[PDB]
Ligand binder design. Structure first.
Ligand code: ZN
Ligand code: ZN
Ligand code: ZN
Lengths: 183, 66, 260, 56, 611, 111, 103, 89
RNA sequence: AUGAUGUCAUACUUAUCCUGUCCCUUUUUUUUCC
């Protein structure tokens, strides 16, 4: 029974819907809760083959690490008629980049993620790491408060939110630095 | 893979997997002089008698199957 | 050998003529071609000629593009890649996809040839692999994974494992697919990651998948667990967790609990 | 039948016998006639099919 | 166990009841040499050999009497071959008493044509015309007749293969693919045969059609089953007009479908091999490696007992062709399932007392196993020898010849090891070396030849010195088989470290260059190569300047191939021994020879240049 | 240190002809030794004693003067124990002493 | 070798190309497509893709007119086709359809 | 159709022809030749003396393994002389 | 809101391919004469 099977585990929450159909649940219960091991990715039982292009069409093409940006190659790379291309062979010009071998002997020495407890899955990008108590900069600007966000003054009167019951927000039951006024 | 002992597959049982890791642990014990000596220290026996009891426990461990 | 007797202008013309020799139907032709291209890369120096490689239209498949990629590798060796990388990494920006996966290959062969020297550049390539390994289309995951492989063999033992773990995160979801090239790619990937990271972390990702109810997950995680199992079977001993003993069987190994 | 088809094909080949690089359409003609040598019965059946049908 | 002898009389009685087949009986008894080991496996194998029904009856009664005695101390298939040989004796006999045109019977008539056709009389009268037709083929041909045409003005139906595309049909292939031509469509099995014409897409069409078709039929294997496929294939692969490519492609589809189907093919195994065994003997090499591959996949795919019980009746078949190619078949299947599994079968065969042809076959099987397995024979070499040894003394000749030949192949794959395993074989062989005329002699020389490198330089001293005489005398035979054998022999005997130079220099070299160096040899291929090798080794012993010095003058000979031969010979020689031994004048003749020969080149080749 | 990989137990012939190496399970290999033309030691190609599911307690060289060498392998089979749910094969199973015979002429190792 | 079956991609690209460049430049349009020549592009336009071509069932009048004319000028399809306002291949197919369904 | 023979690895040195000369066998690569190839005389014998490990031509050189297959320890398995799934000749 | 069935179609992958290769198919009623 999926009911009583939940009494045999320190963290029975690990047991799930299809878990009761396992060939050896009396073990998998004890494995899945192993100390430092990580969960199985969730993209199965979703038939979508692990990705679609919905959220992936709004992403930037790429952005360089700051160590590579300060170098100055970015502006050097940027157009040509065909006969100019056969002229570019007959004419040819040398040294368009003309990089500083001192600079590219400098950056990656002189100048120059996630822990193990995380794993990526399909749709996850920003959300988990905007929460009750955590907001973005600009919307601070529209709000215009100098370094609580002021409707956590009314989270005093009307009470802690039904939606996020576990809530703590600064100064009330949560005894705050920078942006993040609640956890 | 098959002819390489310890090879697993989707139908692998608990009992077989754990008796595998047992036997492999025992081959490690036979292997490393020190850890063996640690065992001899803790429970007082000869190096010999230790290795002998292990070689007895090679086929059995966990006991009968299911 | 000599290479001084001829002025540079002649050389760069030789380059722009060499570029289309890569249509050869023969492999040895391309061989000598790429090696020469490296030699003249030494005769001149990197930036111009690697730019002339990045000019490539990518127009046909293999038969070949990826030979130009190999030229990017060997060129990156002939003078220090310690110079060259920013140009390439910038050239992943371009919206044209096949050349994006092209420069991914360039990183792959690149680390394959540089070996130890990747103890630094790992960091530089790490976020880009993040962008690539996060999938636009399968070839990204594949090629990027190959990069993770050769990087993973190359850097071994030098203490950079952390970022390789981070990249292993993004590697890990790709485990599931039926496409032969991406699955064998991922296999090579997780093998190199096995040796570099050490088995313990691997196994800590491979535990729960063994007994999972579904057949798929068991097929795969058991394939992986076998790959982890054959090599380094000696070192696995410590990392098998504690598993409680049932009625008919004693699943606790008490030897490890003997305390002086 | 093979006799006839052979003769006609040779005749067609005779116009191009000097064979400079010619052009595209001519290239199609040489390649197609050349095809007719390898698999004659195919060509004969296709021909009789035209003769029985196509009016345009 | 003497009641396994009298018990062999008992088993002979029972199995004989359930007549006269020696093989199955010795296969049964063949489990005795393991005694107390024998087990339920004997029920499995024999299950296929006799009826699987009686199989449980006989094996069960055998274990009872066996266990008790210890304490107290396909048939239709073979029935067809017997009738086949008996009709051969009837017809052959009649002529003494006195082909495909022999008159036929209505059951035989119903045998050829496939399903769904009717026999017609139109009249009884037109039938009487058909009966007088014979008499009137002479009579009415001698009578008035002619044809004419009138000028008058003049519908034309016909069928290619239309649907959408249907790549073209050769004018003959219609017979096979006619069912596709009719356009009746969309109304069970008839639709599976009808859709199975995707074969046609594999045979003829564009390369993409062949690819996609090939996959589509691969994934439908489990669906359609082996029966319909082979039923619709084997005629094509049997076609008299078959191409090279088309053949190879049908071979491919047979492979790819046989990677899947395993238990299914059991009824069709023979029905496959009959077409496939001709692939093993072929001029094309790639055809041969393919054939060996697909028979490997078939035998391993099917069961051992399936193969064995299948292939027996081809052993005694009248034609030797099927016997031979069948021997190579057993070679392939034995490479598949291993020597020890198949041993008792063979060891039973070579002792068969019925007729010699069988033993000839089985021995040939020993050989082709020797060639195929080669170096890997090593473990069972002893048992194999113990089998073959009994044929050397047999009254029939062939069996002796092919036997000793098989010893040769063994020893050649036995390169030096296992000398004592050949041990008991020797003493007869040497004796035979004295008394034989003709091909068998040469064969013995082949065997002994490959043996000598495996002996001890002391025993082989004597024995060798004995062989040298006959070896000398026999240079002169016109037989080219002879010359091949004695050639390679001279290599091994005289390339022995325990042989003295001067003796060769005197006795051998003059006849050697006399008879062996001639324009009969060089034009042939194998004789060319082997000659090159042997001469190279003689140089390796007696030294350089001798051989070269005698063959230089032939650089200037007219024909090419001969010049090519001596040229590559000089090449290898000066490659190994080094040019230091060469004197001055002979060196002038060298350089001039090499330039001169090089100045006339009919073909482009490396031999002259590398030379 | 492995389960199936040799190097564990080590034995050698009194005449030094062939050295036998063995693991704990499944793999027992033999290297044959002969001095070269200069009487300097040359090692042969390996051989294979492989026997499935067989534990090797100890391996000791055996003395046969100028013979086909012998080897004493202590063995036991657990395949009886794995297929016996009762646990009878845990008892009533005696370790098999087997002498392998190397054979130079046949150049393999037969039980 | 160039010849083959027409593809929706090639056919739509042919639509766009004809729209942009104009009717009289064929070599320019054949340049964009692969495995097709200029003649084939032109005849493919005027035979089928051309919007002025009428693709639909034949009315009774068109059948009367087609049959009458075909009995008037036997086997001449390129003369008749403009008179009835249909493509030569089309009115051919329809004629063999009228004799086919007529018996 | 084409797969390893995987017979026990002997002391015989590997032999590659013109074509295969530079390739590390398993990784298919030309990079970092380091260690040496060993195959059994069961795979290498006779007409196979100095034969290519692959195509069946005369060996002009000896195969060297990469460093990649070195650390992954694949060079220690059965003799990597490819056999076609017919015979080897 | 991506299941199944279709011989539509296009991209793409594998430093795969394109030059290697003929060598044991030699099978027959034994039959080379100072
Ligand atoms: Zn081998
Ligand atoms: Zn090769
Ligand atoms: Zn490698």
């Amino acid at each position: 029974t999926v009911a009583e099977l939940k009494q045999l585990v320190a963290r029975p929450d690990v047991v799930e819907m299809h878990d009761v159909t396992a060939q050896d649940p009396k073990l998998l219960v004890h494995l899945k809760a192993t100390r430092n091991s990580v969960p199985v990715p969730r993209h199965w039982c979703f038939k979508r083959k692990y990705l679609q292009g919905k959220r992936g069409i709004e992403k930037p093409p790429f952005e360089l690490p700051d160590f590579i940006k300060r170098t100055g190659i970015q502006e050097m790379r940027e157009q040509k008629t065909m006969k100019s291309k056969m002229r570019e062979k007959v004419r040819p010009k040398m040294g368009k980049i003309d990089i500083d071998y001192q600079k590219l002997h400098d950056a990656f020495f002189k100048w120059q993620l996630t822990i193990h407890g995380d794993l990526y899955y399909e749709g996850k990008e920003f959300e988990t790491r905007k929460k009750p108590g955590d907001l973005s900069d600009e919307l601070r600007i529209s709000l215009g408060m100098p370094v609580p966000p002021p409707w956590l003054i009314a989270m005093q009167r009307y009470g802690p939110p039904p939606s996020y019951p576990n809530l703590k927000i600064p100064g009330l039951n949560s005894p705050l630095y920078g942006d993040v006024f609640g956890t | 893979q098959s002819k390489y002992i310890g090879t697993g597959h989707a139908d692998t049982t608990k009992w077989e997997w754990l008796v595998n890791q047992h036997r492999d642990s025992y081959c490690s014990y036979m292997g490393h002089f020190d850890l063996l000596n640690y065992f001899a220290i803790a429970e007082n026996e000869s190096k010999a008698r230790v290795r002998f009891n292990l070689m007895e426990k090679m086929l059995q461990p966990c006991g009968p199957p299911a | 050998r000599g290479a001084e007797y001829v002025s540079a202008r002649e050389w760069m013309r030789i380059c722009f003529e060499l570029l289309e020799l890569l249509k050869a139907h023969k492999k040895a032709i391309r061989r000598a071609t790429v090696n020469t291209f490296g030699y003249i890369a030494k005769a001149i120096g990197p930036h111009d000629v690697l730019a002339t490689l990045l000019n490539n239209l990518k127009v046909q498949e293999r038969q070949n593009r990826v030979c130009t990629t190999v030229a990017i590798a060997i060129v990156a060796e002939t003078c220090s890649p310690f110079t060259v990388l920013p140009a390439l990494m910038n050239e992943y920006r371009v919206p044209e996809l096949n050349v994006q996966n092209g420069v991914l290959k360039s990183l792959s062969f690149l680390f394959e040839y540089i070996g130890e020297m990747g103890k630094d550049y790992i960091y530089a390539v790490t976020p880009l692999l993040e962008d690539a390994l996060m999938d636009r289309d399968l070839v990204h995951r594949q090629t990027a994974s190959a990069v993770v492989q050769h990087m993973s063999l190359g850097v071994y033992g030098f203490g950079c494992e952390d970022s390789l773990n981070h990249l292993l995160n993004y590697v890990w979801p790709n485990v599931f697919e039926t496409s032969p090239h991406v699955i064998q790619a991922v296999m090579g990937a997780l093998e190199g990651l096995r040796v570099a990271i050490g088995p313990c972390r691997m196994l800590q990702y491979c535990l729960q998948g063994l007994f999972h109810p579904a057949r798929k997950v068991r097929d795969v995680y058991w394939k992986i667990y076998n790959s982890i199992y054959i090599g380094s079977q000696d070192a696995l001993i410590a990392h098998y967790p504690r598993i409680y003993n049932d009625d008919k069987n004693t699943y606790i190994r008490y030897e490890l609990d003997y305390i002086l | 039948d093979t006799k006839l088809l052979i003769l006609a094909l040779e005749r067609l080949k005779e116009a191009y016998s000097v064979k400079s690089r010619l052009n595209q359409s001519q290239r199609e003609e040489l390649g197609l006639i050349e095809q007719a040598y390898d698999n004659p019965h195919e060509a004969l059946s296709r021909i009789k099919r035209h003769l029985l049908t196509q009016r345009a | 166990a003497e009641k396994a002898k009298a018990g062999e009389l008992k088993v002979v009685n029972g199995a004989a009841a359930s007549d006269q087949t020696p093989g199955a009986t010795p296969k049964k008894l063949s489990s005795w040499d393991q005694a107390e080991t024998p087990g339920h496996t004997p029920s499995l194998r024999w299950d296929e050999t006799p009826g699987r029904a009686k199989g449980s009856e006989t094996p069960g009664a055998t274990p009872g009497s066996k266990i008790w005695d210890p304490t107290p101390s396909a048939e239709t298939p073979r029935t067809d071959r017997g009738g086949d040989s008996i009709g051969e004796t009837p017809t052959p006999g009649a002529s003494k008493r006195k082909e495909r045109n022999r008159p036929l019977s209505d059951e035989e008539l119903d045998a050829m044509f496939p399903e769904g056709y009717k026999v017609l009389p139109p009249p009884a009268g037109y039938v009487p015309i058909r009966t007088p037709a014979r008499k009137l083929t002479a009579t009415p041909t001698p009578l008035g007749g002619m044809t004419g045409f009138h000028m008058q003005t003049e519908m034309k139906s016909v069928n290619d293969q239309p649907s959408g595309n249907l790549p073209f049909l050769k004018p003959d292939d219609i017979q096979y693919f006619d069912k596709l031509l009719v356009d009746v469509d969309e109304s069970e099995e008839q639709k599976e045969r009808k859709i199975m014409k995707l074969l046609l897409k594999i045979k003829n069409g564009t390369p993409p059609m062949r690819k996609a078709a090939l996959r589509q039929i691969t994934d439908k294997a489990r669906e359609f089953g082996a029966g319909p496929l082979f039923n619709q294939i084997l005629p094509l692969l049997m076609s008299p007009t078959l191409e090279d490519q088309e053949r190879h492609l049908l071979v491919k589809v047979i492979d790819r479908i046989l990677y899947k189907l395993d238990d299914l093919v059991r009824p069709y195994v023979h029905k496959i091999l009959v077409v496939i065994e001709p692939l093993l003997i072929d001029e094309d090499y790639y055809a041969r490696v393919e054939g060996r591959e697909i028979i490997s996949n078939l035998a391993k795919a099917a069961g051992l007992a399936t193969m064995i019980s299948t292939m027996r009746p081809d052993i005694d078949n009248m034609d030797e062709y099927v016997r031979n190619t069948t021997a190579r078949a057993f070679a392939v299947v034995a490479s598949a399932l291993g020597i020890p599994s198949l041993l008792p079968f063979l060891k039973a065969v070579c002792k068969s007392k019925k007729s010699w042809q069988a033993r000839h076959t089985g021995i040939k099987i020993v050989q082709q196993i020797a060639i195929l397995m080669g170096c890997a024979i090593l473990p069972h070499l002893r048992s194999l020898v113990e089998i073959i040894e009994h044929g050397l003394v047999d009254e029939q000749q062939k069996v002796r010849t092919i036997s000793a030949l098989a010893i040769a192949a063994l020893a050649e794959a036995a390169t030096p090891y296992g000398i004592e395993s050949f041990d008991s074989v020797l003493k007869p062989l040497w004796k035979g070396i004295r008394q034989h005329r003709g091909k068998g002699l040469a064969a013995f020389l082949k065997a002994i030849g490959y043996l000598i490198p495996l002996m001890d330089a002391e025993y082989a001293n004597y024995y060798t010195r004995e062989v040298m005489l006959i070896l000398i005398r026999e240079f002169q035979s016109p037989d080219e088989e002879m010359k091949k054998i004695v050639l390679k022999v001279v290599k091994q005997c005289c390339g022995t470290d325990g042989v003295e130079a001067n003796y060769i220099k005197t006795e051998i070299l003059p006849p050697f260059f006399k008879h062996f160096w001639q324009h009969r040899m060089a034009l042939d291929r194998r004789n060319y190569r082997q000659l090159v090798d042997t001469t190279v080794e003689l140089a390796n012993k007696v030294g350089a300047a001798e051989i070269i010095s005698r063959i230089v003058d032939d650089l200037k000979d007219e024909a090419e191939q001969y010049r090519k031969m001596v040229m590559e010979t000089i090449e290898k020689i000066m490659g190994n021994l080094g040019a230091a031994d060469i004197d001055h004048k002979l060196e002038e003749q060298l350089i001039d020879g090499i330039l001169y020969a090089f100045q006339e080149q009919t073909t482009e080749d490396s031999v002259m240049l590398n030379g | 240190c492995r389960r199936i990989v040799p190097g564990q137990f080590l034995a050698v012939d009194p005449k030094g002809r062939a050295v036998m190496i063995s693991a704990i399970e499944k793999q027992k290999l033999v290297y044959i030794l002969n001095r070269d033309a200069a009487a300097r030691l040359t090692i042969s190609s390996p051989l294979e004693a492989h026997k499935a599911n067989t534990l090797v307690y100890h391996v000791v060289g055996v003395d046969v003067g100028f013979e086909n060498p012998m080897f004493a392998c202590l063995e036991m089979d657990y395949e009886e124990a794995d297929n016996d749910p009762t646990g009878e094969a845990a008892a009533n199973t005696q370790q098999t002493l087997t002498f392998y015979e190397l054979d130079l002429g046949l150049n393999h190792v037969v039980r | 070798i160039k010849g083959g079956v027409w593809r929706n991609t090639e056919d739509e690209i042919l639509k766009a190309a004809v729209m942009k460049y104009g009717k009289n430049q064929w070599s320019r349009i054949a340049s964009l497509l692969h495995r097709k020549s200029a003649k084939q592009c032109k005849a493919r336009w005027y035979e089928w893709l051309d919007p002025s071509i009428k693709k639909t069932e034949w009315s009774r009048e068109e059948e009367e007119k087609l049959l009458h004319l075909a009995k008037l000028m036997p086997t001449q399809w390129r003369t008749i086709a403009p008179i009835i306002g249909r493509t030569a291949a089309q009115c051919l197919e329809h004629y063999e359809f009228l004799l086919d369904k007529a018996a | 159709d084409l797969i390893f023979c995987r017979k026990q690895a002997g002391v015989a040195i590997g032999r590659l022809c013109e074509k295969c000369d530079g390739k590390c066998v398993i990784c298919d690569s030309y990079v970092r030749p380091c260690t040496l190839v060993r195959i059994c005389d069961e795979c290498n014998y006779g007409s196979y003396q100095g034969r290519c490990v692959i195509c069946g031509g005369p060996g002009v050189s000896d195969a060297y393994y990469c460093k990649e297959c070195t650390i992954q320890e694949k060079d220690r398995d059965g003799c990597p002389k490819i056999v076609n799934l017919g015979s080897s000749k």
